[PDB]
Each structure stands twice: as C-alpha cells, then as structure tokens.
Design an enzyme around this catalytic site. Structure first.
Site, short mmCIF file in Angstrom:
data_model
loop_
_atom_site.label_atom_id
_atom_site.label_comp_id
_atom_site.label_asym_id
_atom_site.label_seq_id
_atom_site.Cartn_x
_atom_site.Cartn_y
_atom_site.Cartn_z
N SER A 132 9.89 -5.63 -7.75
CA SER A 132 9.68 -6.69 -6.76
C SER A 132 9.55 -8.04 -7.47
CB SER A 132 8.42 -6.42 -5.93
OG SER A 132 8.68 -5.44 -4.94
N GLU A 155 13.55 -3.76 -2.14
CA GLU A 155 13.94 -4.66 -3.23
C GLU A 155 15.38 -5.15 -3.08
OE1 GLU A 155 12.93 -1.64 -5.82
OE2 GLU A 155 10.79 -2.01 -5.58
N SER A 212 5.94 -7.86 -2.27
CA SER A 212 5.36 -6.55 -2.53
C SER A 212 5.81 -5.52 -1.49
CB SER A 212 3.83 -6.64 -2.54
OG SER A 212 3.25 -5.37 -2.78
N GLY A 213 6.21 -4.34 -1.96
CA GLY A 213 6.65 -3.26 -1.08
C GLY A 213 5.58 -2.74 -0.14
N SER A 214 4.52 -2.18 -0.71
CA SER A 214 3.42 -1.64 0.07
C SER A 214 2.40 -2.70 0.48
CB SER A 214 2.70 -0.54 -0.73
OG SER A 214 2.05 -1.09 -1.86
N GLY A 215 2.36 -3.80 -0.28
CA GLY A 215 1.42 -4.88 -0.02
C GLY A 215 0.00 -4.54 -0.46
N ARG A 216 -0.15 -3.46 -1.22
CA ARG A 216 -1.45 -2.97 -1.68
C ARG A 216 -1.71 -3.14 -3.18
NH1 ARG A 216 -1.59 2.45 -1.46
NH2 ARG A 216 0.65 2.63 -0.98
#
EC number: 5.3.1.27
Length: 177
Positions: free
Chosen positions: A48, A144, A87-91
């Site tokens: 990312s 991505e 960010s993919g999961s945002g975590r």
C-alpha cells in the site's frame, strides 16, 4: 481466466466516481484539498506504501510540495497541510500512529481503504474501494491494484482542471538515474 475477470470487474467499480453524485463528491473533495494544501503527505505500509509512493512522485511531477512519510527529506506536518493514508484493512498500527499525530495538528486527513477499519475514525474524508478478493489474489492484492489506478485517475483529473501537459512532468522528473 477467473483472476483476469475479477481484476477487470474491479476497475469498472471506479466508474462511480464519474457517474454517481455521492462518489463524485469524494473525488472533487480530494482534488480540492490537494490544490488548497501547502504541503501534501502520503503514507502507507508494505504494498500500500509502494502504491502511495507512485502517487507522491506524480504529485511532485505536477508541481505540488509532495512528501512520503518515512523518507530522508520529509519535513514537519503543519496546520495548512494534508495527509493521505492508504491502507487495505485500515487497522495497521503504524498507519494509526501517523494518523494520531496528524490529528493533533489538524483535521485534514484522508483515508483510502478497502475495509472501514480503525483509521476512518481519524479521517475527515474516507474513500472506500470495495473490491472483490479471490483465493489466488489474496490479502490486499486487488485493493492495491485498484488504488494505483484510482490515484492515476486523480492525477488525470488534476491535469484536466489545471490545464497541465506532459511537459510539466518532464521538467520536474528525475534526470540523474
């Protein structure tokens, strides 16, 4: 060719940013904040982050004061600046650390995510790219890919609105390598 079909249909999801009013507003807001910002900061981890660097470099090519967080000559984040998080999961904890520190300076934080994780709580504008995942296109692979294409379409739209040509890019492009 199941994987190619999934990727092809994921790119079609980006049509919403041109046809649907609620999504067009997110794109318009992203562009407005980029033009009004003094300095623009981009951050992301792993793949990312590499996609983030592709956008950071291109914003620089157009004449903006663009920076990627973590690199050598990246300065302090000030009140009139903008932070874009990918960010993919945002975590991801490292993305949250950067979000928390920027939140103490201003509210100008944008999050480009797949899943609406913890980072959205710190964002002023959230741009979800809800793509289809697969067994052979795992983790954030499709996000991505779609995010890179989305970010290049944002650059395309910035060039159209400000009447910029390919000559602006050649003028500022690295010529030492």
């Amino acid at each position: 060719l199941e994987e190619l079909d999934i990727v092809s249909n994921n790119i079609l999801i980006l049509k919403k940013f041109y046809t649907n009013d609620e999504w067009k507003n997110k794109l318009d807001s992203l562009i407005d904040r980029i033009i009004k910002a003094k300095k623009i900061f981009i951050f992301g981890v792993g793949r990312s982050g590499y996609i983030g660097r592709c956008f950071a470099m291109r914003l620089m090519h157009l004449g903006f004061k663009s920076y990627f967080v973590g690199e050598t000559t990246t300065p302090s984040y000030e009140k009139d600046d903008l932070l874009i998080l990918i960010s993919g999961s945002g975590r991801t904890e490292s993305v949250l650390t950067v979000a928390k520190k920027a939140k103490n300076i201003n509210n100008n934080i944008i999050a480009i995510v797949c899943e609406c994780g913890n980072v959205v709580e710190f964002a002023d504008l959230t741009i979800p790219l809800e793509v289809k995942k697969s067994k052979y296109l795992p983790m954030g692979t499709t996000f991505e890919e779609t995010a890179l294409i989305f970010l290049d379409l944002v650059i395309a739209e910035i060039m159209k609105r400000l009447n910029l040509d390919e000559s602006e890019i050649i003028k500022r492009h690295c010529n030492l390598l």
